[PDB]
Structure formats: structure tokens, C-alpha cells
Amino acid sequence: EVNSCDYWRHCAVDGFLCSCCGGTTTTCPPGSTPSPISWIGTCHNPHDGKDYLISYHDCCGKTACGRCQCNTQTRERPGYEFFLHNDVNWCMANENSTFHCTTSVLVGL
Amino acid sequence: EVNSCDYWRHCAVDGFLCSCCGGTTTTCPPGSTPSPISWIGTCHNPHDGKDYLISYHDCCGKTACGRCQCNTQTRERPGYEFFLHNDVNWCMANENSTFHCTTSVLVGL
Amino acid sequence: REVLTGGHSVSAPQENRIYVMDSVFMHLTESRVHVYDYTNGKFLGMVPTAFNGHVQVSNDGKKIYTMTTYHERITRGKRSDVVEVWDADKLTFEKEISLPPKRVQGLNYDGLFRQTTDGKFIVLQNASPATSIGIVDVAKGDYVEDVTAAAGCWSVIPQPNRPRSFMTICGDGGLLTINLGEDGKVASQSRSKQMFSVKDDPIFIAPALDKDKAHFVSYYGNVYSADFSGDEVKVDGPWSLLNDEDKAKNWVPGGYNLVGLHRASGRMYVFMHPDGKEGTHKFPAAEIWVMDTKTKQRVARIPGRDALSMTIDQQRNLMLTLDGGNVNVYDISQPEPKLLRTIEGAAEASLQVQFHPVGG
Amino acid sequence: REVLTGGHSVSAPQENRIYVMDSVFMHLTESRVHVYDYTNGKFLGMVPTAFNGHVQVSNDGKKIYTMTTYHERITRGKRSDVVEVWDADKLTFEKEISLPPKRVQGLNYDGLFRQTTDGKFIVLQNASPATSIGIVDVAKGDYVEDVTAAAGCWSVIPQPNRPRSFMTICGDGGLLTINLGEDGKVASQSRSKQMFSVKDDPIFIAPALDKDKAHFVSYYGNVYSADFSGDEVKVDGPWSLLNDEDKAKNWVPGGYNLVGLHRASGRMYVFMHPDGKEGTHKFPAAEIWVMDTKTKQRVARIPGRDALSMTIDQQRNLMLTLDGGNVNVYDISQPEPKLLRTIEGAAEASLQVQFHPVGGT
Ligand SMILES: N[C@@H](O)Cc1c[nH]c2ccccc12
Numbered sequence: 001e002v003n004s005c006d007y008w009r010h011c012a013v014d015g016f017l018c019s020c021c022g023g024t025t026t027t028c029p030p031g032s033t034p035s036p037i038s039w040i041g042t043c044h045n046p047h048d049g050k051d052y053l054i055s056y057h058d059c060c061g062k063t064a065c066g067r068c069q070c071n072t073q074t075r076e077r078p079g080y081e082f083f084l085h086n087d088v089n090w091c092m093a094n095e096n097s098t099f100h101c102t103t104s105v106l107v108g109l
Numbered sequence: 110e111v112n113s114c115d116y117w118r119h120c121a122v123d124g125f126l127c128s129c130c131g132g133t134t135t136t137c138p139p140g141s142t143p144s145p146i147s148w149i150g151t152c153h154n155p156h157d158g159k160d161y162l163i164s165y166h167d168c169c170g171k172t173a174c175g176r177c178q179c180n181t182q183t184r185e186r187p188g189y190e191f192f193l194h195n196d197v198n199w200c201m202a203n204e205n206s207t208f209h210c211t212t213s214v215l216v217g218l
Numbered sequence: 219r220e221v222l223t224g225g226h227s228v229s230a231p232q233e234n235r236i237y238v239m240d241s242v243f244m245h246l247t248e249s250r251v252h253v254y255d256y257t258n259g260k261f262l263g264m265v266p267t268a269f270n271g272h273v274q275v276s277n278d279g280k281k282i283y284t285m286t287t288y289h290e291r292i293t294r295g296k297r298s299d300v301v302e303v304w305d306a307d308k309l310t311f312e313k314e315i316s317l318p319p320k321r322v323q324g325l326n327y328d329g330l331f332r333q334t335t336d337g338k339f340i341v342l343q344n345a346s347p348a349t350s351i352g353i354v355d356v357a358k359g360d361y362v363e364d365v366t367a368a369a370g371c372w373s374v375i376p377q378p379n380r381p382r383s384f385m386t387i388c389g390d391g392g393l394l395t396i397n398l399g400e401d402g403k404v405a406s407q408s409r410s411k412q413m414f415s416v417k418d419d420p421i422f423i424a425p426a427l428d429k430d431k432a433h434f435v436s437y438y439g440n441v442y443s444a445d446f447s448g449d450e451v452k453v454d455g456p457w458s459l460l461n462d463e464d465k466a467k468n469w470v471p472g473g474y475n476l477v478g479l480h481r482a483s484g485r486m487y488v489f490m491h492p493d494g495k496e497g498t499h500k501f502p503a504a505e506i507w508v509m510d511t512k513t514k515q516r517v518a519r520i521p522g523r524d525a526l527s528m529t530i531d532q533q534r535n536l537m538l539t540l541d542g543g544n545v546n547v548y549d550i551s552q553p554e555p556k557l558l559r560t561i562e563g564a565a566e567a568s569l570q571v572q573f574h575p576v577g578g
Numbered sequence: 579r580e581v582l583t584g585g586h587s588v589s590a591p592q593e594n595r596i597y598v599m600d601s602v603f604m605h606l607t608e609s610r611v612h613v614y615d616y617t618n619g620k621f622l623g624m625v626p627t628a629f630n631g632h633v634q635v636s637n638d639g640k641k642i643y644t645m646t647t648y649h650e651r652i653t654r655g656k657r658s659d660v661v662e663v664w665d666a667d668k669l670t671f672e673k674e675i676s677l678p679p680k681r682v683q684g685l686n687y688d689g690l691f692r693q694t695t696d697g698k699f700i701v702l703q704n705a706s707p708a709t710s711i712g713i714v715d716v717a718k719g720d721y722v723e724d725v726t727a728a729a730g731c732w733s734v735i736p737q738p739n740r741p742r743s744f745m746t747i748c749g750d751g752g753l754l755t756i757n758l759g760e761d762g763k764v765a766s767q768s769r770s771k772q773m774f775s776v777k778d779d780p781i782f783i784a785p786a787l788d789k790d791k792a793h794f795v796s797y798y799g800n801v802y803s804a805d806f807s808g809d810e811v812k813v814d815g816p817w818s819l820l821n822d823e824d825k826a827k828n829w830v831p832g833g834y835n836l837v838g839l840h841r842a843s844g845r846m847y848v849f850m851h852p853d854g855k856e857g858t859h860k861f862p863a864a865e866i867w868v869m870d871t872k873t874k875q876r877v878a879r880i881p882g883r884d885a886l887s888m889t890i891d892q893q894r895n896l897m898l899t900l901d902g903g904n905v906n907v908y909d910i911s912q913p914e915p916k917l918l919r920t921i922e923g924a925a926e927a928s929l930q931v932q933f934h935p936v937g938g939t
């Protein structure tokens with residue numbers, strides 16, 4: 001379920017799901033570094049019926065994972081609403097900006 | 110017909126045909142550099158029935174062309190007959206060794 | 219005996235050339251520009267652009283500019299963000315221009331990497347993630363200005379009626395105009411009134427750009443305009459792309475570089491799809507709509523061929539569309555576009571195609 | 579509520595791991611190693627290896643060694659050929675060892691990037707295009723010097739019965755043996771008699787490697803043998819892989835890393851295809867044949883699944899095969915191999931898979 005682009009909390013992922021890349025929804029694959037910054041999505045949880053803030057931190061410093069590419073756009077907005085925008089590399093400020101995969105971290109309601 | 114892997118002069122090409130890459134059988138695509146060294150193949154001319162030496166100089170210093178990949182092996186031999194061998198990068202001694210595409214240069218009978 | 223030679227120029231005339239920016243997202247450190255002849259689909263050559271390159275051709279047609287990021291050991295070591303100048307005909311590297319390590323890394327929207335109308339300055343988007351606009355002096359081969367006044371704004375829309383002016387879209391729903399001096403430093407600036415509601419009717423950043431005005435389409439199919447015939451930009455809108463029947467089937471725009479303007483006629487081209495709802499703003503085109511911007515009504519609609527991005531050549535009356543891998547070539551000399559050919563396999567993952575400039 | 583973390587180790591234990599060297603030929607500057615769990619097909623992580631990377635695991639199973647080429651600006655600027663040392667469990671970079679700018683650039687045959695039996699030296703093929711063998715001192719993190727004696731030879735076959743000796747195949751059709759000193763320099767050497775006719779019966783370079791001997795197959799389905807139980811290598815062959823029926827249908831070997839030896843049983847594994855002729859030596863396997871090297875008879879044949887390369891695990895009695903993109907896992911504890919599973923999409927363009935070492939002392 002979590003490895004599917006349709007999984008509820010992946011609603012604003014543009015990238016490869018880290019859970020298909022040797023990591024999980026909340027951990028970077030070995031040898032890849034979390035981004036301190038991210039875009040944010042608001043996603044609806046069909047199970048409990050509530051909406052949640054999801055932080056899409058990237059994992060960085062390794063070349064493209066290539067697995068489970070997703071391009072979902074719920075509530076995503078262009079770069080003049082920068083932290084809602086997912087057509088930029090959220091690895092952009094890491095020590096190494098090479099993009100590896102995207103995580104989907106639950107923040108709160 | 111020169112863009113096909115079956116073309117007679119391409120009988121020991123392992124790489125992308127330069128003629129599909131903005132070059133010709135005997136010229137490198139713009140901004141790629143010929144290798145001074147090459148593997149050699151002996152190919153049968155289906156018209157006059159004679160065998161010809163073909164020199165497979167690479168074009169180098171640009172990333173993979175990606176078009177018209179061929180892997181033909183007529184009279185190809187392993188690395189202990191080094192200049193008959195096509196599983197190595199004949200760009201290896203160029204100022205930039207990145208492999209772009211392979212030419213098929215007619216030497217003679 | 220035959221002899222292999224290098225040093226050759228591109229085999230087709232400049233006027234035949236198009237540039238397909240292939241992100242190669244699956245292997246993004248080996249992005250490149252593929253150069254094609256649009257008249258016959260022939261592959262002419264390529265320019266390597268390392269990690270997530272961006273590309274534009276100089277306004278005078280003589281050079282290709284790329285923007286990219288290197289690291290000493292790719293995935294580790296010191297970062298170098300650069301602009302490179304390449305010869306357009308030899309497809310060879312000429313010069314590297316150092317940038318601060320904050321050039322935008324992101325999908326290839328046109329407005330992230332542009333130039334002034336006079337061709338003397340390259341104008342590029344930065345994100346650290348704080349946004350600013352960077353200015354490169356082409357003659358000097360130098361980064362000369364960092365426009366921090368553009369913080370909280372995004373993308374560059376050059377004004378074709380002024381030599382060194384451009385606009386950017388800001389978080390307040392208005393436009394910031396920057397006028398550069400002959401040294402590339404900001405000479406003056408101005409801010410428009412609110413053009414669109416950011417919260418209620420967000421626009422796509424891609425302009426349908428005329429000589430003295432620009433149109434933008436919104437997530438809900440409205441059109442906004444910015445008139446820059448004067449020093450102060452005048453803004454208006456919305457008008458709707460949609461009639462009642464269109465609304466009933468929930469038609470909305472979608473794509474990336476999703477609009478274009480044919481300047482002689484005023485026709486605006488837009489990728490559209492039915493069953494629009496939250497989250498469909500990047501969907502492939504079901505149709506291309508052709509809008510008369512004077513009457514503010516649709517004049518034609520044609521199959522979209524799943525296209526995501528487009529570009530227009532004014533002088534040959536052409537539109538290219540691009541579905542990520544394939545480029546379609548259309549004749550737009552009459553109100554209904556006519557499909558001339560498709561170039562299959564032009565890229566693995568491209569969201570941007572551009573013609574070689576012929577205007578000078 | 580949740581917090582993103584890095585610094586994690588590979589989730590499956592070492593004994594489950596395999597390494598698929600993906601050349602990514604279409605984008606050869608972004609080659610990498612994909613780490614998979616062979617028991618369930620799970621992707622575990624990866625190591626980036628830049629332009630045409632090569633890879634091996636340290637004999638002790640602690641480190642991954644890669645070999646690659648960088649340039650300051652990829653397609654221009656100064657060249658750096660390197661070996662890199664990576665932690666196997668964290669999949670993180672630890673050390674770069676500088677090489678002379680002539681490491682072999684080529685497809686991923688095992689014998690281009692190897693190590694001595696004692697693990698103290700990395701032993702690699704150079705080509706400038708003049709050939710030599712390069713020696714890296716693992717403890718020092720240094721390049722030693724070229725083995726120039728190996729000019730006109732190709733590839734590295736370690737001698738599993740000696741701590742720092744290896745062989746290479748030469749253009750005269752014999753083997754050159756190199757015995758290193760404790761410092762990684764050549765201490766002694768010897769050259770065998772001609773093993774095979776280079777003109778009339780060229781061999782594939784991939785050894786079927788035993789502890790004190792190695793077997794090689796030829797373009798025409800013959801087998802040659804090198805026995806290095808003594809200080810001088812004794813060479814023999816050919817015998818034929820082919821019975822009369824086989825010969826009638828023109829069966830010959832084909833592939834890249836195309837042979838394997840199960841040491842305990844003496845079974846040799848070979849990719850084979852029918853209708854052989856000049857130019858078919860790299861054709862995908864129609865079948866895998868299992869040969870008894872003691873009786874010199876075939877004991878099994880099974881579908882090839884278009885495989886091109888293989889590797890054998892002595893410790894778990896397994897064989898992996900690889901068709902360029904997919905990895906097949908076989909139980910080889912009996913004469914007839916049994917297919918356990920296939921891992922689809924393990925690579926885009928791989929000609930080499932290797933197990934994480936278990937045991938092996
Ligand atoms: N989640 C994003 O960082 C993945 C991405 C989207 N567009 C990009 C451009 C360059 C690098 C990464 C990306």
C-alpha cells in the first residue's frame with residue numbers, strides 16, 4: 001500500500017518513493033541524507049476522515065533511485081507559493097544536492 | 110541503410126552508430142572528438158564478395174548518443190587480442206574519455 | 219582510404235533547428251539538450267548539461283547558453299553552479315561563468331532561465347531556498363547582480379518592448395518589474411496592483427507573451443493580463459476560457475509550458491482537459507484550444523496528443539508540442555492548427571522545446 | 579509527530595545481499611551498483627559509480643570497492659581514475675585511492691577488478707591502450723606500481739591457494755603468473771606453455787575457478803585447464819563440451835561472465851546456444867549446461883532464460899544468472915539446478931552480479 005502513488009499521504013509527491021528505494025516513508029535509504037527543507041502537502045486520510053499536513057523531505061547525495069516514480073499534485077501550487085511547490089529539488093540546500101528519493105512525513109492535522 | 114545494425118561495414122560495432130547521432134560513418138557529430146586508436150573488424154562486402162578492414166574509431170567527449178545501439182561481433186576476439194576487441198571503450202586514451210558514438214571507417218581490402 | 223575527422227558544424231541551417239531539453243530524470247546527472255531538424259525529424263547533435271541542466275539560445279542565434287550544477291565527485295565534494303556558453307554551430311564548449319551556489323534546480327519552465335531583449339544579460343532564477351534573480355553579463359562573462367527585491371517572487375518574463383526589463387510573479391498576486399542599467403545592476407523597479415488572487419485563482423507561471431503585454435491562464439480556466447506598454451504595468455482579469463458547456467464538463471488548463479501566443483493574429487494556444495478538479499493542473503492535454511484574445515472567445519479546438527509543453531515560432535507560423543518524449547510540429551498560419559509531423563523519441567523526459575531564433 | 583532520519587544500515591543481513599552492477603550504458607556517466615535481497619527480491623540500496631563503474635566486495639565482507647573515472651567537468655577537465663572504499667552496511671563513502679589515468683574502461687567482466695586471496699591487494703586491469711596490471715595496497719590506501727610484465731595480456735585470475743598470486747591470459751595463448759611480495763611489487767613470475775591456439779580456438783576469459791585449477795571454455799565449445807597446484811602452471815586441453823548430437827546442432831558457448839564452477843562437486847556451468855557460427859559468442863543462453871569436469875560429461879541441461887552472465891555461491895550452493903535486466907536465483911545443490919525466483923528490473927544494463935561474501939576462509 002505505501003509503495004503505491006495512490007497511498008493517501010503521497011498526495012503531493014513528485015519523485016521516487018523512498019520506501020521503494022531501501023528506505024521507508026520516514027527514513028532515508030542508507031547513505032542518503034535528509035533535506036532540512038521541504039514542500040508541504042495537505043492530504044486527506046480516508047481511514048479516519050481527517051486532513052493532515054505532510055512534509056515531503058527529500059533524501060539527497062545519491063543518484064536517482066529510479067523506483068516508484070510518482071507525480072501527484074493535490075493542493076500543489078507554483079513557485080510564487082514556494083513551500084507548496086513540487087517542481088523544484090528540495091535537496092537544493094543540502095551539502096550534496098543530487099536527488100535520490102522523496103519521503104512523506106506526517107506533521108499533524 | 111547505413112543507420113541499420115545489419116549494414117555490412119558495422120560487423121563489429123559495439124556502441125551507437127555515429128550516423129544516427131548527427132555525424133556520418135566517417136565523421137564525428139559536432140563537438141565530439143575522434144579517437145586516435147580503435148578496434149578493427151574484418152567485414153564481408155555482400156556486393157563484391159570481398160572482405161575489408163574496418164576501423165571502429167569512437168567519437169568522444171560527449172555523453173552517450175543513445176541512438177542506433179548495435180552489438181555485432183563478426184571476428185571479434187577477447188582482450189588478449191586487444192585491437193580486435195570491442196567490449197572496451199576505444200575513447201580510453203582521449204583527453205576526455207566519455208563515449209559518444211562509434212564510426213565505421215573503411216581502411217581497405 | 220577513409221579518414222575520420224572532427225571539427226564539423228551542424229549539418230542543417232539554423233532556421234531548421236529545435237532544442238529539446240532532456241532532463242533524463244531517471245538519470246538526472248546526465249541531462250542534455252538534443253538538437254533536431256524540425257523539417258524532417260533528423261537528429262543533429264547534442265549538448266551535455268550534467269545535473270538538471272537548463273538551456274536557451276542567444277537572441278542573436280550564435281550561441282547556446284546552458285545552466286547546470288557540478289560537484290567535484292558528483293555526489294560529494296564542492297558544488298559549482300555555472301552558466302556555459304557553447305558555439306551554436308560547432309556545438310562546442312567556449313566559456314564557463316561562475317554563479318553563486320543557489321541556481322534553481324527544478325523542471326524546465328522557460329521562465330527560470332531567460333535573457334534581456336537586447337541579449338546582453340542572462341536573467342536566471344535562484345533559490346537557496348530564499349528566492350532572488352541572478353544577472354549575468356554576457357560580454358564580461360560575469361555574475362553582476364543579485365536582485366533580492368524579487369524575494370518571494372518566481373520566474374522571469376522579459377519585456378520584448380524594452381532592452382533590459384523583465385517581470386516576475388510575486389506572492390502578493392502582482393508583478394514586480396525590474397529595469398536593468400547598462401551595467402546589469404538594477405536601475406529601477408515597480409510593483410503592479412494585485413493581478414490575481416493567489417488563494418482563490420492561482421495562475422500558471424507560463425506567459426502567453428506579446429510585444430507589450432502578457433496573458434496568463436489560471437487553475438480554473440481564467441485569463442489574466444499584464445499590459446507593459448508603459449513604465450507601470452497595468453493588470454486586469456479575469457475573463458473565462460470557458461463557455462457554459464465547457465464548465466459543465468469541468469474543462470480546465472493543464473501542463474507545464476502550457477500556453478503560447480501567435481503575435482500577428484492574437485491567437486492564444488492552451489492545453490486543456492476535461493473533468494478538472496484539485497490536483498489535475500499538470501495533466502496532459504486532451505485538447506489544444508485556440509482563443510481569440512481580442513474577442514475573448516474560443517475559435518478552434520483540436521486533439522491534444524497528450525502534450526504537456528509547447529512553444530511558438532512567429533515567423534514561420536509554427537507551434538511545437540511535446541508529450542515528454544515526442545515532438546509534434548504544427549502549422550498555425552490559419553486558425554485551425556495542422557499537424558505536419560511527429561518526431562518520435564526526441565527525449566526520454568523533456569518538458570521544454572525551443573526553436574533556434576531567426577529574428578536576430 | 580514523525581521525524582525523518584538518515585544514518586541507517588541496510589535492512590537485510592549481509593548473507594541475503596547481492597550486487598547488480600548496472601552500467602546504465604544509455605547514460606554511462608551515472609552507472610551504479612544496485613543492492614538486492616536475493617531471498618525476496620527487495621531493493622536494499624545503491625552505490626553511485628559515475629562513468630562505467632566496476633565493483634567487488636572485500637573478501638572479509640566489510641567493504642565495497644568501486645573503480646571509476648571522474649573529470650572535473652565530466653566531459654571536459656582533468657581526469658581522476660580512482661578506487662573507492664565504501665562501508666558495506668551503511669553504503670557510505672569512506673576513502674578514495676588515486677590510480678594512474680588508465681584504468682580499464684569496458685564491460686564488467688569479473689577479471690578486470692579483483693583482489694588477492696589474502697585481501698591485502700586490489701588487482702585491476704590497465705589499458706592506455708598498452709596493457710598492464712595495477713596493484714592497490716589496501717592497508718596503505720595507495721597505488722603500488724604497474725605490473726609491466728603483463729603487457730599483451732588481459733584480465734586477472736586470482737589463485738585461491740596462494741595469498742598474493744594471480745594469473746593473466748596472454749596473446750601467446752599461455753598464462754602469465756605473478757607472485758607479489760608483501761609490498762605489492764612483483765616478487766616472482768612464470769609463463770606457462772601455450773594452452774590454446776589463439777587463431778584456431780580462442781577461449782572466453784571468464785574462468786571456471788577452483789582452488790588450485792581453472793577451466794576455460796572456447797568459442798567452439800572446447801575446454802582448457804590450468805592447474806596451479808605447483809609453482810609452475812601446467813596446461814591441458816582441449817576436451818569437448820559437445821556430444822555428436824550437440825555438434826550436429828552446432829551448440830557453442832555464449833555470454834560474458836558465462837561460466838561458473840561449483841567447487842565441492844566439480845560441476846561446471848556454462849551458457850550455451852545452438853546454430854553457432856562466427857559472431858555468436860556473446861549470444862544469450864538458450865540453455866545452461868551443467869558439466870561434470872571429472873567425468874567430462876554433461877549431467878544436466880535447462881532453459882537459459884536468455885542469460886548472459888552468472889555467479890556461483892560455494893557457501894549456499896546457489897547460482898545467479900542475469901539477462902541484462904533481470905536476475906534469476908537457482909539452487910544448485912543437486913546436478914539439476916532448480917529455479918527459485920526471478921528479480922525483475924534489477925538493472926537497466928548489467929552484465930555482472932555478485933553475492934555478498936559469506937565465509938570463504
Ligand atoms: N521532490 C523533488 O525534489 C523531486 C524533483 C522535482 N523536480 C526536480 C528537479 C530536479 C531535482 C529534483 C526534482
Ligand SMILES: N=CCc1c[nH]c2ccccc12
Pocket residue numbers: 123124167195196197198199208211606630683684685
Ligand atoms: N566501441 C565500444 C564502446 C564501449 C563498449 N564497452 C564500453 C564500456 C565503456 C565505455 C564504452 C564502451
